[PDB]
């Protein structure tokens, strides 16, 4: 039912510089508990997906501080202060306000060629 | 160590002489209170501290029911909600139920009559089935 | 950390039906829910269905609505996903996961297994 | 139905009071303990107001045990924070109100406390634009 | 397991009500007492209960500083010496500090004033600052 | 300065008794509570608290101070030398409650004559309060 | 039982200065003192210096007075002994120990390390 | 500052017989705590030193009862009731009254040859 959206589709980062990615959702995610049900996932070729941010603005256990995010309502952004060589992958955002669950379109990162 | 008794001539030790399951369930006690005391309860009155107590019990129960309905509305996770509702319904009730029974029987049969019943239940509980009479002691 | 291992994946002849195995251990299965995730090559993740601890309720997406079913056997703590009326668009690797951050996002993801349908061998 | 009013004061008087006014639940409990340990737990039956404080202390003891239980179970950390905050903040507010009202009644005159609530109700109403600074103190 | 203040009307919990750091210093108090009544503390007088209590109390401080001096002379190891002297001085001195102030209050300003001031100071500290009177309650 | 003056007693007079004469602390304590749990009475209240606070210091020392050597230096001091004054004080005060003060002083004075008398000329009897 | 391991020992060219490493673990370094023991072949033990837990005070023997210094870093619980103006009479194996029987005699002794000075190699 | 002294320099013992060794110090070791600061050490070729007697007259933990000593003031003696084959070594006495610490001269034991 919910239409998901992501942007930009691609973003090549010269390691050591910050970057931001934006994911947008149609319907509001502010429940009556003051919380927002939004997710940040990390996926690696040949590996199972891993968690990035939980509950909208809380870091998942064991995740390095290099990744941070914030936002509320229908707008959110994923920010990485310093890009490391192991950060290459395709990122996803998900919705869990109302069933059925819907996923985004994806965002893959790489190194800007010379 | 504030006990809810000792003001009427009883102690939690005396109350802990009857089976937990043997006391009635809340709905009946609430309905009987609403039956006749409703006219007097709302009206302002003095003395009979059971009058103030009853109100405190009713307010606590209302507060607990409000929490239950709020939990029902929110807390999407299904499994935990059923666990919390069962707990609030089953475990916490016993204290309020005992309070209601004590106060309703005082207001309906004098303090001394209640005390005699409390002390008499000792004979019933101690007696084993062979010695124990078939008849169980009932309020009069 | 909980470890989940799937089984039953492989090639299946067209027109038949297949059942996949996803068992879990090391945590209280009766106290948490389960979810199914699918990935055909070329696209991203897609949600399919989920079941609650009791199992009385269930939900499905419109793509496979009425043709897939999910059930659990709490005696052995094993998940089950039944596939019928398979199509060429269903060729994908399947993952079963568990979510516990207040019932919103999946936390531990299994290794997954791929399912392939075709006539050649 | 109305806990207050048994002594001449309606819920609407206390509703006007902001949250900041009532002290924390902890200072009040220790206050009551240290100041009335002898009177609260006494055999003689009199001074009807002790009934409210002797009933409220047990009522909050119930909530503390419920918080401990919520803490032990509910493996999800997220739900524990929600439930604990609710019990500690929202349910507690009523206990704060009742404890303050009854303590003030005990230490001070009745007509005096009631006069304090009616005056404050009038002082808060009307904007802050035109009213002498500070808030009338009970003295 | 007895409270020294019980007979005089105070209780340990009442003293615990006030913040710990509020109480004055030790050497200052001692000097105040000596300057106040050298005769009273030296002359033998019947009754004079708080004076008899003060006499008995000062011996505790004297004996503790004698054990501090003893630790200073002996107990060569630096590690234990600092810990023992620090406890002898700071940690245990709170009870003595409280006893001296309580007694001196009764002698100069009366027991009724100190008793009423004890609760009032706690009342003033516990509530929010903005809604309390400016300043703090003067002793007398 | 000296507890004993207010009660018509001298620290020198009280010292005239030999050290071994005073009993131990544990024994004196028992009769105090059992028979007199209920002006002098206060002094006992203070002394019991003093002993209790010392015993509390002892256990704190026992728990920390992991070095075995240092424990004895303080433990023996507090349990032997520090408590001699307590042993003296409890007996002196209890005697006032149990027996009369007039008999007590006469008892105290005669013991001095008893110690002065040579051992060769010491009578076969032991002076008891009765 | 505490185990202490030294390091940094070896041959040093004449005229230079060398620093030896003595680290400890398994007990409260901040609550106990440390000592240095030396043994040239042919003779017995000889006391050199010691430092208190705080480190404010220190002592030295007349043989090496004013030419050796000792310091401790409580952050990592490691001992340090600095050697300057080395002579041919300083060729010996060095031991660091700890004493806790009421601050008198050393209790646990490290394995030690030998220091040799000479021109040939 | 303190002059240490030991005697006899050597003592060969037929094993199974008692023996005594004496260590003497110039200045008194009786502190105001009633204790005496004197030590007994054991040293083995190719090994680190080990403790024998602590605080003058108290046995170190784990040491066998076969060794005992006593004494006070400026005179002390180390006594071994029964000599075993593993008892061969060089023994030392130390001082800890006043800094700086001083060691003795040593005492080595062996088996009397035939």
Numbering used by the authors:
A (entry chain l), H (entry chain L): 1 to 114
B (entry chain A), E (entry chain C): 2 to 141
C (entry chain h), G (entry chain H): 1 to 121
D (entry chain B): 3 to 141
F (entry chain D): 3 to 40, 50 to 141
Quote the study on this structure.
Hepatitis B virus (HBV) core protein (HBc) plays a crucial role in the virus life cycle, making it an important detection marker for HBV infection and a potential target for treatment. The HBc contains an N-terminal assembly domain for capsid forming (1–149 a.a.) and an arginine-rich C-terminal domain for nucleic binding and nuclear localization (150–183 a.a.). The N-terminal domain has five α helices and forms dimer with four-helix bundles at the interface projecting as spikes through hydrophobic interaction. Typically, 120 dimers with T = 4 icosahedral symmetry could self-assemble into capsids.
To clarify the structural basis of the interaction between cAbD4 mAb and HBc, the structure of the HBV capsid-cAbD4 Fab complex was determined by cryo-EM. The whole structure of the capsid-cAbD4 Fab complex was determined at 3.44 Å of resolution. As previously revealed, the capsid-cAbD4 Fab complex exhibits an icosahedral symmetry (T = 4) with a radius of approximately 180 Å. Each asymmetric unit (ASU) comprises two dimers of HBc molecules, which contain five helices (α1-α5) and two cAbD4 Fabs, with each cAbD4 Fab binding to the tip of one dimer. Two HBc molecules in the pentamers are denoted as A and B, whereas another two HBc molecules in the adjacent trimer are denoted as C and D. The heavy and light chains of cAbD4 Fab binding with dimer-AB are denoted as h and l, while those binding with dimer-CD are denoted as H and L. To improve the qualities of the densities for cAbD4 Fabs, sub-particles were extracted with an ASU mask. After the 3D classification of these sub-particles, Class 1 map represents a complete ASU, in which two complementarity determining region (CDR) 1 loop (residues 27–37 a.a.) of cAbD4 Fab light chain (CDR1-cAbD4L) are on the A-α3/B-α4 side of dimer-AB and C-α3/D-α4 side of dimer-CD (model as A3B4/C3D4), respectively. In addition, Class 2, Class 3, and Class 4 maps represent the different modes of ASUs, adopting as A4B3/C4D3, A4B3/C3D4, and A3B4/C4D3, respectively. Overall, the structural analysis of HBV capsid-cAbD4 Fab complex demonstrated various types of binding modes in a dimer unit of Fab with HBc, such as Class 1 (A3B4/C3D4), Class 2 (A4B3/C4D3), Class 3 (A4B3/C3D4), and Class 4 (A3B4/C4D3), and also revealed the exact recognition epitopes of cAbD4, which was the most potent and broad binding mAb to HBc identified in this study.
